[PDB]
Ligand binder design. Sequence first.
Ligand code: HEM
Length: 289
Amino acid sequence: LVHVASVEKGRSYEDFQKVYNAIALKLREDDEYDNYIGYGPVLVRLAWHISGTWDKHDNTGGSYGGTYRFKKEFNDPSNAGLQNGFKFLEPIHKEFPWISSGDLFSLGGVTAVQEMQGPKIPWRCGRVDTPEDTTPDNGRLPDADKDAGYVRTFFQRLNMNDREVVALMGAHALGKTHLKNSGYEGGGANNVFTNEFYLNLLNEDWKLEKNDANNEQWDSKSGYMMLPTDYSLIQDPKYLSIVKEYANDQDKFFKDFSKAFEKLLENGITFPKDAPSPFIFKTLEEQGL
Ligand code: HEM
């Protein structure tokens, strides 16, 4: 099973920078969503969930086919709340109907991270929409009620090692949980990409509490929360070392996150040797827009 990247006919960097700019301007303008967090975090989550279905064993799932547009995947209980991100992107797809679905969903994540003052994430085009029968079954995305061993084992399916896992989890500096989506009660939230997830894990006095959906989560008197899978990163000695590293080196975190997130978004895709190089998009701020 091979998925070969194929550049949307005649398109080049300038075309994709236009799409980036459209997403970025809408992020700036539709700022009220989710109590003024805006759409950045949900777009990051969307890009991760469309990629996180991948299975290295058989090359099924992943971002290539844009299969989230089909009912089976759209309605996965693990994807509750992502409809908001899909709705955000729909008008942009109408404006740029030539872009593939997987390219749009992945580019939305890239755009969001950069516009939230995160690292630059190189991005490659050429995902191709695949038919409804290529849609992975539900249940490939991870549960939040588990321990470090679960996290480690889960991420082996995505060909991610312990450093890649800890870097990726730093995206939990962004946004929040919502009881109605996931059964976890949200805490303090931000929409600026920093290494604060790691600082909070190490510095707060966490208490194991039960929420109104009868799930356990870790809460602090400061008003922050951690999922069990978040907290696992300080219970496991290998993960803890890496958490400390990123707490103490913002730049290292940014660089490691950039590499792991690009990898996540490209898993399963074969890029021909004459494919274009990855694009690095300018932010609105860099363009004076
Ligand atoms: C073991 C792995 C993971 C688990 C169990 C997990 C679990 C969750 C849960 C339960 C939520 C709350 C959903 C809601 O209630 O709206 C969430 C939100 C989020 N996750 Fe994860 N996550 C994991 C890994 C990741 C990774 C790898 C990324 C990206 C690189 C990511 C990015 C996010 C973002 C940005 C949000 C916030 C969305 C919002 O504010 O609407 N997560 N995650």
